[PDB]
Scaffold this active site. Sequence first.
Site, PDB file in Angstrom:
ATOM      1  N   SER A 203       0.878  -1.239   0.000  1.00 37.49           N
ATOM      2  CA  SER A 203       0.000   0.000   0.000  1.00 37.49           C
ATOM      3  C   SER A 203       0.885   1.249   0.000  1.00 37.49           C
ATOM      4  O   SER A 203       1.710   1.450  -0.897  1.00 37.49           O
ATOM      5  CB  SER A 203      -0.793  -0.001   1.308  1.00 37.49           C
ATOM      6  OG  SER A 203      -2.013   0.603   1.155  1.00 37.49           O
ATOM      7  N   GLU A 328      -9.198  -5.636  -3.546  1.00 42.22           N
ATOM      8  CA  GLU A 328      -8.586  -4.437  -2.959  1.00 42.22           C
ATOM      9  C   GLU A 328      -9.533  -3.502  -2.179  1.00 42.22           C
ATOM     10  O   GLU A 328      -9.233  -3.104  -1.049  1.00 42.22           O
ATOM     11  CB  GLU A 328      -7.902  -3.623  -4.058  1.00 42.22           C
ATOM     12  CG  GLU A 328      -6.723  -4.328  -4.717  1.00 42.22           C
ATOM     13  CD  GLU A 328      -5.509  -4.424  -3.804  1.00 42.22           C
ATOM     14  OE1 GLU A 328      -5.457  -3.662  -2.811  1.00 42.22           O
ATOM     15  OE2 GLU A 328      -4.616  -5.267  -4.079  1.00 42.22           O
ATOM     16  N   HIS A 441      -7.599  -6.245   0.861  1.00 43.93           N
ATOM     17  CA  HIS A 441      -6.338  -5.527   0.912  1.00 43.93           C
ATOM     18  C   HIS A 441      -5.485  -5.862   2.152  1.00 43.93           C
ATOM     19  O   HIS A 441      -5.962  -5.802   3.293  1.00 43.93           O
ATOM     20  CB  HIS A 441      -6.644  -4.030   0.863  1.00 43.93           C
ATOM     21  CG  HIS A 441      -5.437  -3.160   0.765  1.00 43.93           C
ATOM     22  ND1 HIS A 441      -4.766  -2.951  -0.423  1.00 43.93           N
ATOM     23  CD2 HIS A 441      -4.783  -2.436   1.704  1.00 43.93           C
ATOM     24  CE1 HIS A 441      -3.747  -2.137  -0.210  1.00 43.93           C
ATOM     25  NE2 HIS A 441      -3.733  -1.812   1.073  1.00 43.93           N
TER      26      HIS A 441
END
EC number: 3.1.1.7
Lengths: 537, 535
Positions: A203, A328, A441
């Site tokens: 990320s 995600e 995610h």
Amino acid sequence: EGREDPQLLVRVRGGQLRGIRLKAPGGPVSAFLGIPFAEPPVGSRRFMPPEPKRPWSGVLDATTFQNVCYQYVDTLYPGFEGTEMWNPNRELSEDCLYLNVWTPYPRPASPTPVLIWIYGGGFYSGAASLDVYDGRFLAQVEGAVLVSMNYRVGTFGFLALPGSREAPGNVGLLDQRLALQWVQENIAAFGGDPMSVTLFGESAGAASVGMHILSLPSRSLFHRAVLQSGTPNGPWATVSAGEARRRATLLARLVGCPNDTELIACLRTRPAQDLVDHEWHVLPQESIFRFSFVPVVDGDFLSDTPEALINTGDFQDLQVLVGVVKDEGSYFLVYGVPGFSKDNESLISRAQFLAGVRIGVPQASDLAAEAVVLHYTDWLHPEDPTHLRDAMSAVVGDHNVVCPVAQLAGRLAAQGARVYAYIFEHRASTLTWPLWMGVPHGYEIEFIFGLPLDPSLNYTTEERIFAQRLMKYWTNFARTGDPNDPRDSKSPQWPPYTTAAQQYVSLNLKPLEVRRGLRAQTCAFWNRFLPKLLSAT
Amino acid sequence: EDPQLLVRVRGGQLRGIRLKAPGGPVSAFLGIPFAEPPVGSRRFMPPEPKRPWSGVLDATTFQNVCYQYVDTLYPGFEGTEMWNPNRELSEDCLYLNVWTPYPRPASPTPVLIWIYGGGFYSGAASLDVYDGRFLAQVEGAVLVSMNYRVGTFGFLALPGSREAPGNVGLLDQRLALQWVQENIAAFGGDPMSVTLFGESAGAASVGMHILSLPSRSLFHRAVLQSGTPNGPWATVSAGEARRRATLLARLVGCPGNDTELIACLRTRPAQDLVDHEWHVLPQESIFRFSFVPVVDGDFLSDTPEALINTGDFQDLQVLVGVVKDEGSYFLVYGVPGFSKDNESLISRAQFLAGVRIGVPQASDLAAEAVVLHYTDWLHPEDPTHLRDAMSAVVGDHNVVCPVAQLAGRLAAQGARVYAYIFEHRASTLTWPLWMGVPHGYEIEFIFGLPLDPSLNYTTEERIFAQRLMKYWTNFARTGDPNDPRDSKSPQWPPYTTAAQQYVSLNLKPLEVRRGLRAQTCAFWNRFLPKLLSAT
Ligand SMILES: CCNC(=O)c1ccc(C)c([N+](=O)[O-])c1
Ligand SMILES: CCNC(=O)c1ccc(C)c([N+](=O)[O-])c1
Ligand SMILES: *[C@@H]1O[C@H](CO)[C@@H](O)[C@H](O)[C@H]1NC(C)=O
Ligand SMILES: *[C@@H]1O[C@H](CO)[C@@H](O)[C@H](O)[C@H]1NC(C)=O
Ligand SMILES: *[C@@H]1O[C@H](CO)[C@@H](O)[C@H](O)[C@H]1NC(C)=O
């Protein structure tokens, strides 16, 4: 010294260190935790670039994780494992620039490839000391030298009055750089090869890896990079000088502060928690996947926008592994889009979807928002709450991760890079988030660091073999610039992502499957059409 | 002489002719006048009822074709010549044709009335593919086709003027319908069961008869093939019709005063008007026609979009459909790179160029949106995908997505809709492989032409043809394409906004699909308008 384990005493440029001998399932590993690499950025040094750590006297104890950089603590679902696992697990403090090293035990005979980890957390949170970033498994099983740092986050990392001497911005990224220099000078004392340093992050951390690729001074500090679910380009990872200045000024007002010197000085006299407390309050629109204090285009660390820089720069010398998880966006929906929660199936209405798209895509004009809605609507079943829920997740996922990543893989590959790409499609049997969130995610990390090999974590046996495979992928890549096992070409090959064939592989319990086209049509929308549409409203 | 060929209608007496279908004889009555010749001072004017006549009128031959443009794109080639006029050209053309079983039907028989295409600039009821003998002989149907004025002569309009009020080509059609009411019972036809059906510009005509209150008492059911009244090509505003007529007048060398303007236009040989017909279009186009129906506030009270958006169609029954490759036929008429003789592989450049022509009205940004939507980003430059995408753009924009919108609005506001896609390419087809199943080549089959041995159609195409003939006529009898006697599923289900069900007409048994190009039509029908409306 006398009676200590003589395999745990090591010297670095700052002085002597005592590490610890840790148990990993297959045997012992060496750990040196809490190594200071900068002068504590406190007092008059807040918002300032890191200075190298002044050398200490005696043996520094390096057996426990050090303080976590001061940050917002998530309270969405208090006590719930799914959010708590990202939360800080050591004391919060501005004095937090420390790094960690895991190595085989004993430390390796010949020079060993190094992996440096950069945690995510939206530039507002995170720490190198979380369980999911445990280097003990990579070090033991793959013999790797694993390094991970703390870097300043939130205001303390990224608040900026661009052009000012007293808050030039990006200092959290400069923290990361200092650690990379530190590795160059000191990692050979641990048996690491400072001529084979592979960065990898998730990320915000993946974004950081990206910005080091794009900043000239950093490029001499590593040789290969892995970006997991994150990019330097895209809508959340950076801000203009203009927008950073606006947020910095608003936050100053919000906590009591009226010339940049005067303003910064007053900010320096505020307790850290008073800044953290008002951090989320300076975003321009009701959003999700937007973070207030992030890397800024200053013309220095970043000479131009990341979009510009990848559009133009040379990358023949580069090897890069990039990829994404299946779902995600789902994780981010429960932090703002009305209708979503971990506790129900989050079946929303069309009206909640339209409202959600305005939040997921906060910078969209009315027209652009309608375009998104029209594209993601399923016109067979345009009101089906299930299809709308999944579509919402897909909007946030595609806009913020998958299409930036596709654009990044696309631009790098064309411009000389060797690119390898994956989609991570396995839902951990141990997952605490609801089924509807899919493969959310951040939940590939557990497998790359190899936590399933810890018998006591109640993972499945096939999950154990799976984690073993990825560790082999990441380290083979780190060693060679190539995920594929050299001697093992009986098992299916992972081909490089090219512009011509756009190949990538599926990472699941089944063997490697080569797929063409990385959400190709939908990303033409986000990467080609949409910016022209915003640029005509 | 033969009493079956002797019919008395309001205007006088007719002699038909006995014709051979492959399975038996039919009675044909060709050349029946339904209107006073729109020649001279009556050019551009609405039609008037035919005066009565003495003696027995000979109705054994096709009459003249309405004066129109003759295509020259591929001189001698069957594929284009089959649309060209097969009788002499005249303004004296308001005549109709009637086929019935031989002997005459004993019972009042359902009537099918056919309205040709030709973009409102061409067409005739005498074309070989509109031969009504097969439907008449095999399904025992009474089949009626008309001529109507096309091009300038049928649709040149100075809106609000006495002399060129617009839409007279449509009014020609309507008078033919009033004629069928008044006279078809004498042929054994049932005036209380009249089904309209037409292709392209004809389908649109039908569409506009549905949307004009005076026509609604002249028919009960409708079939629209490969065309709609809504869409980018079938109508023009009063502003634009006034523009094209004014411009054509200056090209023809005329002149203010509508009257003085239409007076001088009346003193011009027909070719002098047809010669400049294509020169009044506003942008370089394909699938755009110079003189078409006009939103005059009379025949069409408001725009077709507006009218279908608000009408009540509760006791209407409609059969709508498209072919697989609508756009392909039109590419060779002006998009660089395309041809009947190549395989028309095109570069990306040529594809961006063709979109401005496919969608002449689009802004820079809107054409950017078309290109980005139809590009295959796995294969962004593959000449075959680009060619097939060009065809799809033209098809979807001009036919398929107008059809999906109409089918949606009709079903939603009370109508009973049946939808199809036609996916069989004729074995006899003279166009190249790449065009697939082009616009127009279902008609051969609906009218039953494969049943003629000498046409050299395959055995299965004969069988397929019979299936379609039975769908269409069953629809005419009942408002339902399905046989009421066969008990085998699948059946052809009604199109609904909820389920969006349609079927596939090809050699294989009926197959039910959902969503008529749903995602792509959302783009054209929902988004694209918001986008031009912001540039
Ligand atoms: C009550 C205040 N908390 C927030 O606004 C918040 C926290 C975390 C995350 C990831 C996000 N987000 O996605 O924008 C927002
Ligand atoms: C050389 C003059 N011919 C035309 O302009 C023309 C003829 C037929 C058709 C279908 C079209 N079209 O597609 O617009 C144009
Ligand atoms: C799920 O819970 C949230 C808050 O508890 C609520 O706003 C939302 O409407 C709920 N959705 C469903 C489908 O129950
Ligand atoms: C693993 O399973 C045991 C039950 O045998 C349980 O007591 C333990 O708490 C579990 N641990 C985790 C992390 O789920
Ligand atoms: C197709 O053939 C015509 C015939 O002359 C030609 O003008 C055109 O350029 C050709 N196109 C291609 C792509 O070969």
